[PDB]
Automatic annotation (TrEMBL), chain C:
Name this protein carries in UniProt: Receptor binding protein
Residues of the full protein shown: 276 to 367 of 458
Species classification: Viruses, Duplodnaviria, Heunggongvirae, Uroviricota, Caudoviricetes
Taxonomy, superkingdom: Viruses
């Protein structure tokens, strides 16, 4: 390489060396009563890897710094500890293969681990992970004690309107296929037989079901209505609406009403509890 | 240090200075009709901090770029504004101490803030945060107006099968200890007394409870069944099942049924609403 | 990498405008494997995934707050009590 050397009357020194093969620069200094320092190389992308979310491959492609496989014979928690010990990275992305012990979820997942201090002997941090079905899981570590993973449920608004309980045999569309859901909420809006304090509106009431594959899901219940007096107790009534689901459609199958007022199905929400 | 100085016949200048203490290089230039520039230091990892999720400490360890403490006497919203004003970071990680005013949650938490433009006078952005219990919270800022924090609920499937209401005194396992949950969903699958439009299946119906510590949680209600005619209204019936929980187990305590057909408990889901 | 999506974009994580993080380990768009986490203008959370360039349906998370707790008797009719947040911040 080319060496540029400087030396003073007190034996302070500076050496800059540029490699004749690669064109990389290296620098070193010496004090009057000291040795030279080790050669400081010029800066390169790979010197940032401890602070990035991604590892830098030899082709300059970007990947996860942590990959955890069932062949490693390690838990997710020990893979995090080993990764923090090997790299000193505090915030980083990860992949975990399905079936890894202590994994955020049973399926394969990808996620982000976040912490402010790489102390594996008293680790403090959090993670957020997403599965091959789009499920969300979150969790934390506190003094190297690990909390149980918190799986989120999820939902979609499938249908909204006002379908009368008397409109039996009517079919309507859904915003998604019902087979994408394990649970459903059916919302019903009612007027009671008598008025209570001058109102007969009940609000809009949820019925939640597991999608067992039944030819009818049955919303049924009771109202108490009318104001209590010393001579008259409040009256009681019963109601039903039956509904069914098929692909991106739903049907009002049947109903029962014990008064002359119109009763409605008004919202349908698809639910997953993975 | 060592100064390498260059100066042309027109008074263009280049000064390269290397510090005799640290071995860091500094460069300055002057034009014929100008002054010297400020000293441009050599490149270092700290010069990237505006674009990273992590800060870089003096020992070269990673940490969060935002740490918020109750001693700071600031809201979380003001700590975000101060951080964006101090650093120009649009996407970054954070820690918030429990009891910080306007915090995503009451306990201590760790999270990610995301935005595309560091404009604190009309801030547009979002956050995701995780607590010391593993709870998840999300929120937004829109024209520097801040929305209320959205805490997500979480769940686990504790048991599934088909246990008859008549099987009173029977006990079964749960996939986790019930004391890990504040709420429970108990699912019941029923056949009605009469058929309606040729079906008596109700689907599988949710009963949701807060885990107040009761010795029985009482799933009870009604069905309407049969087909209406001008001479015969649909009939009515009542039902009950009582359940209890003890560590990693549950028991079918009692039941009532007003028809001869089998009624079942079929799912138990543990729920947290933190 | 991070992303912004405008409200009304086809196939968006949500109908409103949103901001989020996409995560993957290999840039193969002919067999793309990865996940996303997104947040809306109201603070809603949505997650989803891509697997062999097949796209999964977006999973919107619900949310809650404890507004009130105690033991108000059914006989205390006409009594008004406070909530920890405004009810207009909730749909259910």
């Amino acid at each position: 390489g080319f060496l540029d050397l400087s030396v003073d009357a007190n034996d302070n020194r500076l050496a800059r060396l540029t490699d004749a093969e690669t064109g990389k620069e290296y620098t070193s200094i010496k004090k009057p009563t000291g040795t030279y320092t080790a050669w400081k190389k010029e800066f390169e992308p790979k010197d940032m890897e401890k602070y990035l979310l991604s590892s830098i491959r030899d082709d300059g492609s970007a990947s996860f710094p942590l990959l955890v496989y069932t062949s490693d014979s390690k838990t997710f928690q020990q893979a995090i500890i080993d990764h923090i010990d090997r790299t000193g990275q505090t915030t980083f992305t990860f992949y975990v293969q399905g079936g890894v012990s202590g994994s955020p979820m049973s399926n394969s997942c990808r996620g982000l681990f976040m912490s402010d201090t790489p102390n594996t002997s008293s680790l403090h941090g959090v993670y957020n992970a997403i599965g091959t079905d789009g499920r969300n899981v979150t969790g934390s570590v506190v003094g190297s004690n690990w909390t149980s993973p918190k799986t989120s449920p999820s939902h979609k608004e499938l249908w909204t309107g006002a379908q009368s309980f008397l409109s039996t045999g009517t079919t309507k569309n859904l915003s998604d296929d019902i087979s994408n859901y394990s649970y459903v909420e059916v919302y019903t809006t009612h007027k009671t037989t008598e008025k209570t304090k001058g109102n007969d509106n009940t609000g809009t009431i949820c019925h939640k079901f597991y999608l067992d594959g039944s030819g009818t899901y049955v919303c049924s219940g009771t109202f108490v209505s009318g104001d209590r007096t010393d001579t008259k107790p409040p009256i009681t009534e019963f109601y039903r609406v039956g509904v069914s689901f098929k692909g991106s459609t739903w049907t009002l199958v049947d109903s029962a009403v014990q008064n002359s007022k119109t009763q409605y199905v008004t919202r349908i929400i698809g639910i997953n509890m993975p």
